[PDB]
Design a protein around this nucleic acid. Structure first.
Lengths: 167, 281, 156
RNA sequence: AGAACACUCGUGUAGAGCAUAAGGACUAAAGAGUGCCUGAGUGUGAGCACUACUGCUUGCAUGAGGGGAAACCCGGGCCUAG
RNA sequence: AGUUACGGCCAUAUCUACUGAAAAACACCGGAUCCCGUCCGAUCUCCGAAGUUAAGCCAAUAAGAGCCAUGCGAGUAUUAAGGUGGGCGACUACUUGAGAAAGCGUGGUGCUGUAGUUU
């Protein structure tokens, strides 16, 4: 087969949303354990009385992982979801996402004062050369040859983890 | 939404060519080149430094109406004449190229014998010798590259200064600067003569000899060792200052015009369309 | 009633042309000026320093003094039925070199040859004046190929 | 977790913003962020708006002046009122 | 003859699909010890050559969209001067002069300056 032209992970995005006070600190400590990083707190775009959100108030924390560490977390999570995904979960862009309701399934000890949180996982796939669209000098749009398509993303998932993609 | 209607295309204004290509910053260029109306006969020279995956380029350029004129040029790939075997995009190779560039200039102007070289022993700007002709003057053009402490663009710039050209600079940008303390110049000298890489080579042989072979294969092929670098670089600098490279010859590669493709005539284009209708019916 | 600020009534003037927005081109900055040249004012709305008053837009005058990034130009104006000279300060981004002397300078180059020979051989120059177009010329015609014209078009 | 919560990928000539009328101006910015500073210096000339008051443009000299690697810029507020 | 570095005039150069490419370059590419900067060596900064023409850059193709030119529209629309011209008016004929636009047809699809490198 032709080298280059082979799929990889470029990014895994993790986010927890918990609008309020000390809850965000309690949450942040979790992300700081699952990955060796300090996560970025994010703030409310609008003011929404019903949801209990003032504008410019912190509401969530996220962290982005790349390289080897990404492989461990993704394997750890797809197990929790029992290798089962729906055709809804894949985009026209070569990316996919799922959710988890209970952080303790990723293995960490309980500590009853910390609490129970869920988490979103989102995964972005790639082929070499993407740098052409991100570098400062001579920045250009990539060729259709080097994108990742909806079918390819499913094929990669099936191959790599032996999972089942339901219609 | 946008690209769905004709009016989008009809009303659109294109950026200038070198902006579409992301090669030039026009706001920076204008501040750098704009003419002073009272200083008639002033003819500012830019020192242009650019770094490619393969090589370092120094050019000295004057901006004239209709197009920029290149006074002189030097490239790290030419240092192969003086026996440089390795690291053509290294911090040392940046400095060496700026040194080479300066000498070629001062020879043309015949200032060469008045303003002598000075290998990296202070951080002052070049100063006009009394009773003789003034130093050649230039200003630095770094393009789209970022300014930060220890960027390779500033190495070439110190090369040129040490070579005898007058550039205004502040030492804030060199390794060995301190926020509220005197300049530690041994750190600067260290990098110029390649200590930074020797120290990496030495480390890897203790850590992982497999990774060492992967990281430094080209060096191994030349039988260079970490110990050899200072002698290598001292020789390289001296030779630049001492010798001169042979002139280039001109040749007509005209015959390679065979490879150029030529556009279809009207007569052909029409027949091709006609055939396409008939193939369809 | 109308007002009297410094940029009154300049909605049409002092606006960019279609598909020509943005800052000036390099040629603007690399042009050198000298005392005694004729120069022509056209304001660039994107530059906010060194703008002249809108009366002077599109007028041509003569350079009196030259500074780092601006010029002083002499103009004449009628006020209270008398002629007044005015000295206008303008930045170099709002001016272009005038073409108004072009033909005269060519004519001077021809005169400069003749006026030397006129000392050696003649006594006075022929001086090469322009003349307005004269009467219609004479013509000799072969008289084959006649074309007839008629009110054939009825124009309902 | 809903019409409307946070995070992403692709398109995106301005359909946004620019405290305060209306017009003009602005896109690797003049918009949004981040760093440092108090030039919202000091003497003294020449001019533009129908030009007194007022507002602005610009010259020369100085500061144990600022910001920037530097070319450059700054004696209030992007320009036209307070 | 191309390319590459720095440019000039700023779409004949744009936008969308497809296809080609000797040499040398230009790139993608392999790491983070240091200098430097990030939630994140993705970007920026540094140290490298195991791979690859798949991408970009360059070039061709398309009764392509858009842009540029020219012919026609057309002596048409409008307009300066004039008369004891006409009309209740609204407006309009004539005499000596100046003179368009949209649409629609046909052709084009970057040109050049200084230096460097490659049969």
């Amino acid at each position: 087969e032709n080298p280059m032209n082979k799929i990889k992970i470029q990014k895994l995005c993790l986010n927890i949303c918990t609008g309020g006070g000390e809850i965000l600190n309690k949450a942040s400590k979790v992300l700081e354990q699952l990955t060796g990083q300090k996560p970025r707190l994010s703030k409310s775009r609008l003011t929404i009385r019903s949801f209990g959100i003032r504008r410019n108030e912190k509401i969530a924390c996220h962290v982005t992982v790349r390289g080897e560490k990404a492989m461990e977390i993704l394997e750890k999570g797809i197990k929790i979801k029992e290798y089962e995904l729906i055709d809804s979960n894949f985009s026209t862009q070569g990316s996919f996402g799922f959710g988890i309701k209970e952080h303790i399934d990723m293995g960490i000890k309980y500590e009853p004062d910390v609490g129970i949180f869920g988490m979103n996982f989102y995964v972005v796939l790639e082929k070499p050369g993407i740098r052409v669209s991100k570098r400062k000098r001579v920045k250009s749009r990539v060729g259709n040859k080097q994108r990742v398509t909806k079918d390819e993303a499913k094929n990669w998932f099936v191959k790599k983890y032996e999972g089942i993609v339901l219609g | 939404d946008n690209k769905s209607k004709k009016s989008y295309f009809q009303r659109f204004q294109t950026k200038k060519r070198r902006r579409r290509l992301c090669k030039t910053n026009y706001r920076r260029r204008t501040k750098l080149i704009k003419l002073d109306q009272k200083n008639v006969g002033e003819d500012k020279s830019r020192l242009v430094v650019r770094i490619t995956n393969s090589k370092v380029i120094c050019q000295v350029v004057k901006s004239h109406l209709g197009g920029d004129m290149v006074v002189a040029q030097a490239t790290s790939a030419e240092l192969k004449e003086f026996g440089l075997k390795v690291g053509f995009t290294n911090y040392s190779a940046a400095y060496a190229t700026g040194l080479l560039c300066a000498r070629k200039i001062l020879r043309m102007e015949k200032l060469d014998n008045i303003y002598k070289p000075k290998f990296c022993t202070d951080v002052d700007v070049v100063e006009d010798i009394e009773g003789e002709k003034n130093a050649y003057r230039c200003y630095l053009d770094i393009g789209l590259s970022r300014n930060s402490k220890g960027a390779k663009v500033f190495a070439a710039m110190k090369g040129a200064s040490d070579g005898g050209i007058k550039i205004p600079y502040s030492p804030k940008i060199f390794p060995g600067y301190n926020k509220d303390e005197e300049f530690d110049q041994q750190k600067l000298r260290d990098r110029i003569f390649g200590k930074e890489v020797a120290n990496y080579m030495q480390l890897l042989k203790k850590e992982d000899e497999t990774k060492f072979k992967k990281q430094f294969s080209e060096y191994i092929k030349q039988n260079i060792n970490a110990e050899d670098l200072e002698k290598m670089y001292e020789n390289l600098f001296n030779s630049i200052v001492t010798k001169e490279i042979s002139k280039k010859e001109k040749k007509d590669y005209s015959a390679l015009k065979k490879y150029k493709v030529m556009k279809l005539t009207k007569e052909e284009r029409d027949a091709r369309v006609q055939q396409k209708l008939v193939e369809n019916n | 009633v109308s007002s009297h600020g410094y940029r009154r009534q300049t909605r049409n003037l002092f606006s960019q042309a279609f598909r020509k927005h943005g800052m000036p081109n390099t040629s603007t900055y690399l042009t050198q000026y000298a005392v005694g040249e004729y120069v022509d004012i056209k304001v660039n709305p994107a530059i906010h320093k060194g703008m002249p008053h809108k009366y002077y837009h599109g007028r041509t005058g003569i350079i009196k003094e030259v500074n780092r990034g601006s010029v002083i130009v002499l103009f004449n104006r009628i006020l209270a039925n008398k002629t007044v000279e005015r000295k206008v300060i303008v930045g170099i981004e709002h001016i272009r070199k005038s073409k108004c002397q072009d033909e005269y300078l060519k004519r001077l180059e021809i005169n400069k040859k003749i006026i030397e020979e006129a000392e050696k051989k003649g006594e006075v120059p022929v001086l090469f004046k322009r003349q307005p177009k004269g009467p219609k010329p004479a013509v000799e015609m072969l008289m084959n190929n006649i074309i007839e014209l008629s009110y054939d078009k009825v124009e309902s």
